[PDB]
Design a protein around this ligand. Sequence first.
Ligand SMILES: [Mg+2]
Ligand SMILES: [Mg+2]
Ligand SMILES: [Mg+2]
Ligand SMILES: [Mg+2]
Ligand SMILES: [Mg+2]
Ligand SMILES: [Mg+2]
Lengths: 256, 256, 256, 256, 256, 256
Amino acid sequence: MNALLSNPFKERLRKGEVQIGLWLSSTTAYMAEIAATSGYDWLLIDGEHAPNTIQDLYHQLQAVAPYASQPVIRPVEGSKPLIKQVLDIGAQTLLIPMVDTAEQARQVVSATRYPPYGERGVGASVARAARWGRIENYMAQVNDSLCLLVQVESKTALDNLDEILDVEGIDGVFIGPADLSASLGYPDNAGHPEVQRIIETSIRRIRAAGKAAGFLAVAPDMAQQCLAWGANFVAVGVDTMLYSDALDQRLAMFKS
Amino acid sequence: MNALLSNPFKERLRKGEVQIGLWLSSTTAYMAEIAATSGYDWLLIDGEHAPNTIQDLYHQLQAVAPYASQPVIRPVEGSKPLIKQVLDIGAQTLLIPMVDTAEQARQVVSATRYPPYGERGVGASVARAARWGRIENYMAQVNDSLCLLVQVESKTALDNLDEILDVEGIDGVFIGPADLSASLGYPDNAGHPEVQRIIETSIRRIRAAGKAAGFLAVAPDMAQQCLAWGANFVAVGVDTMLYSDALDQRLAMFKS
Amino acid sequence: MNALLSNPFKERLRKGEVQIGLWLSSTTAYMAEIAATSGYDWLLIDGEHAPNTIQDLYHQLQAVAPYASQPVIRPVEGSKPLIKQVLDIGAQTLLIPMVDTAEQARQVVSATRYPPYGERGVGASVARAARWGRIENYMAQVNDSLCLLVQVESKTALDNLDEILDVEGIDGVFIGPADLSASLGYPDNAGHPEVQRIIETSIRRIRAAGKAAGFLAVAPDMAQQCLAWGANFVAVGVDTMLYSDALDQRLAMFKS
Amino acid sequence: MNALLSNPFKERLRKGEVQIGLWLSSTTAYMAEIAATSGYDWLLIDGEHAPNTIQDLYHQLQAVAPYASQPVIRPVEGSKPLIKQVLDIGAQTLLIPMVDTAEQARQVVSATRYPPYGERGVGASVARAARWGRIENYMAQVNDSLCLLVQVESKTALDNLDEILDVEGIDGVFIGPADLSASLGYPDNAGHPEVQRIIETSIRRIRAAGKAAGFLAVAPDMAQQCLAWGANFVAVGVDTMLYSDALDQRLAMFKS
Amino acid sequence: MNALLSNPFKERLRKGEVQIGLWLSSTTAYMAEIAATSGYDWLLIDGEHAPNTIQDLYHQLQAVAPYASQPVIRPVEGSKPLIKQVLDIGAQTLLIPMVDTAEQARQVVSATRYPPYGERGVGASVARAARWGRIENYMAQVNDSLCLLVQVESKTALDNLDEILDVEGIDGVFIGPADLSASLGYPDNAGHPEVQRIIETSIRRIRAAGKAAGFLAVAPDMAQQCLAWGANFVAVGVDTMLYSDALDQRLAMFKS
Amino acid sequence: MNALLSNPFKERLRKGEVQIGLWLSSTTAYMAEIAATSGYDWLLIDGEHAPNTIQDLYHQLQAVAPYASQPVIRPVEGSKPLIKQVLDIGAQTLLIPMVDTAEQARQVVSATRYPPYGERGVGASVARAARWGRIENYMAQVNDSLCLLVQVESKTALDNLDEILDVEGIDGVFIGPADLSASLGYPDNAGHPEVQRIIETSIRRIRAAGKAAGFLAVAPDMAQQCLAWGANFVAVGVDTMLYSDALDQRLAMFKS
Ligand SMILES: [Mg+2]
Ligand SMILES: [Mg+2]
Ligand SMILES: [Mg+2]
Ligand SMILES: [Mg+2]
Ligand SMILES: [Mg+2]
Ligand SMILES: [Mg+2]
């Protein structure tokens, strides 16, 4: 097998390319493989808001591996040890929740990088990340193939957006509209013109800074709008929601 | 908790009532609970064509238990020991594949009944089926609450349909259109007029014999047609197919 | 299904009713279901002193769901991300260990509330807590249906007991005799007059603040005593201890 | 490690010693370890009436391995492949259900022995049975350390008892009184006034033919009786029953 | 994704290429993936002599899927329902143990084929075999991409070897030295001149019929010999044996 | 069962005996048992750089329990709650990563001791640590049987080595050469020509302060050297590395 790491999601992001994603929220490797057969550009394995253990995450990576869709892992939080776990299992693209400050953003980057630059503990070289040694010179190759995406989803984070965007090692900034809406004084209502204005300017600011801009839009109209605004890693649904809706729609054909 | 067993699916079947179902093919308790929130009348936990162990089946029963949707279990085959396993875990409604003869149908019934009448081994009385003893006089109550559905899905089985329909202990006969189509000399094409004619007469014969008639129709048009013909336990989709289709439909909105 | 949240444990607690409970310590969904058939008022699913993963917790919730006994979840610690995980899986009643200050208690409340009331990140809409959107207006209903119980189980905690009892959003204070005893310099001797004294006074003070008073007593004598002292959410047993004792007692009939 | 096979259960059986046992019915490795700390002489890991997979059986063997209590495995049925599976995982004592004829008993014996004497499939050096080759000359050692117990628990099996007792390789004959009573036309109450005699005579006949005699008696009164009669491998409880009873008993102190 | 079935193992086999393989005996997806990074031509996932459930088999397939090594699945026995399960999860190459007669061999082929060609029940359309409908015209493509290997590993099997080699649908015949040796009256002594002789003649006869000839040799000397004799699907190791030996060899450097 | 705690690893450490170890990196109970049959002195169950959940850790302890090899658990980090979890499951020897200061070392020691001396949460009588109460006076016995090893593997930790060595309750100090080399500015090649001296001096300093000295050396040449220097708990391989190498070596015989 190949001795070079590659991260196709990162490669595409660097080329400015638009990547269409789906949230995977069931924790199950069975459904992750099924979802991978759809051909989304990326799949967000949600270790934050679905009850995934580190083993569930591992199994979902193994499930999607031979398919074209690229996995992105969101851990429970961007702490040193939880980041350590997901990087060692060979998650090359991370989405980190609740990044509110440039200092938090620098600490997240430090957690992903080995000494000199960061604080990542050594051990991937004999784990899935270096494919048990088949990846030669893993410590030398790794930074170029790691892709780091941070969520800006509070009023504090928007206030700090420029500082965060200037942090070395951050590849993209993701806006989660429902948390942001809540924090801005409009809980349960991202549809308010103030919120929409903030979302649009924030996306444009992220792209203007040369970084990738991300979004989750479960309403296709909102997804089209964020794409128009320049978001270029956009998740367009949550698998469990698509599932439940499909189930309801089929059943409705037979019930009065 | 209650000392009486009840099988609402059987109660409704006895009353002639139409019951709308969905196949569950992921093996996962996580998705089974999600599907149960839809409100289908029944959910077919497929131990035949999805890789369910006896524990997967157990977990899916525990998942759906507090919801209104009634579970129906299909084992890998209707052998004595596999039937034994699923009855002891408290699956009160079974769908048995590949029942081709009245003798096979009698043997299936014998597998579900304790001595005098049948060959079921004792032990449920301390298992999930009798809720570890909370169900009093389980051996006396049980037959009235067990619901047995058999699949007629070959040319041999159709030839034997009258004999099968006269077998004591059989509550319903299910027609699987794709196996039947194959066996009738039309593989991959249930849409042939010969096959449709056989399906319609078979449904009408089953109802004319006072038994419930079942069908799986993944095309809603076919489901409506089988309902019109008198099928009264009709599965109208496979959850994994509904899932994949929903995923494809969402993605298509963003890809040219 | 039902679109409304309810919390029977919390309604009873608010009425000042005595609720008799049991610790579940095996991690197993299989034993959780068996225990639920006893009809204890509540079952404490122990994620602190038994090796439960978030998945084990989930499966135990699924197991007890159809039965009348109400689940309570104790996480390994009361941190923001661990509280997030248990809320999202739909645990409506939490027992939080080692709450030592009014500040820690406020932080715990904040971890359970969405903006503006706290720090809880959204995502329960696409998870078990909101039954995948079947619970309508979850964000609006949720605070009413969440029951928070905090453990006062150190010397520091006792010093701050009045300050803790004044924290809005705390429904009950639970005295942990094993940790408290040790904290006081009487490890493994909770029966000491000095400890029994402090337990009694602590219980009366909790109730005097209009909050529920909780306790675990593995000795029935002690359980009746703490009930006489005013404790109204009282766990009276640990299931693994009851198992071991029952097995020993049966064996001893044939070894003597 | 130790290169010798030993079977303390079989050695004590051969000495005619009385061995006191407990059914393990939860399928869980967690409860199997807890139960092993009681020091029963044997623990019956029930793969017939509890929903154990071969993996669950493996994990319960691993759990109990360091304790004094000797494991006995009952598979779902005594087929060649299912006996092959449980022998390969290092189950050295088997309890086989539904052995109704001498021809069946011979076929079970052959399934436990390698060719050319029997039909056990050869591959134990790549499994736990030979501790991955740490047991030297496993194929030489294995017959002497394997203990075969069959269940005679039907009318037909009773009619065939003498003949079954003449089959070489059977170490013990187990009578299940609830199965036999059902088979004799007494569904539940277990051993009725009518079949006590039929049971006693059998126990005495079994011991008379130089074989061990087995029984499960969940009533201590009945267990004393069967021992008085000559039964020397007697299971005296079912762990899930002992659990439920103990939970009920502790709770009744507070609903009193 | 790709809508076409292919079987690289089968294409190579048809070309008469030598394919070097490894037994996987741990049941673990974790070790299966590690093994796949070695680049053996094939990996034998052993459901006969290791305690694999259908789920363990599934997870091992998912693990090795992205790597070049091609999986082969051996079920616990070659029965119709066990073959059904492994085909449906998408195992394209099967190794069937203990095929003793031309009749058994025909039955195995029939178990792998849909009507009119055999008895296989439909349902792979909604399973991993057809990648949930992403493989278009599965029913039409499938026979071409299925590779059947049968074990000739008893005296009965040898007597019927020519009849077995004449069965249409068999791609390869595998000689099992452990079972064959025992069947011949030389258990645990496959090295006996009489056995080595019969292995050699058997290999030449297999190849003479235009079928592939298979073998497992845990001794490299024997492996080279069987290759020299004409065997072209040759497993050369059992992964758990290689693990144990490697661990012993490292330890021995510090114990001597 | 035996009511006394013992820690053979700690007893031998105290005697200054040399103990030879192996890293267990696969997370699987199946491989842990196989590895235990080699008779290494100790086996490091790696919960920091392999994706172990607390349940995986539990199952590997259960697997190795009856063998002579002594288990050592490394948790993801040495936080209070994670040390609480692993102590409660009966891990009596801990290896704690990233111990950089004396204050950290004191905080780790306190996390291992009950109040009022430390801050370990009290609940071991409802867990495996006290074998569910079969270990009498566990709280009395526990300090003497717990063995605490800390990792000093960074520039800061090195600067602080004397002070760390002065902390009471630390039984051994482990040096990880790849982490330290990275921290000192040598990413990979592990221990470079430049840091051998820094390593040797540390090993001698550790033993000089009356503590045990630890090392992982995957190169046998380096392992002999560190032993020559005074290291007395030395891991000499990583099981997944030994596996991969052995697989490669066997395969190379046929790609030759
Ligand atoms: Mg968010
Ligand atoms: Mg069918
Ligand atoms: Mg406590
Ligand atoms: Mg029986
Ligand atoms: Mg063989
Ligand atoms: Mg390190």
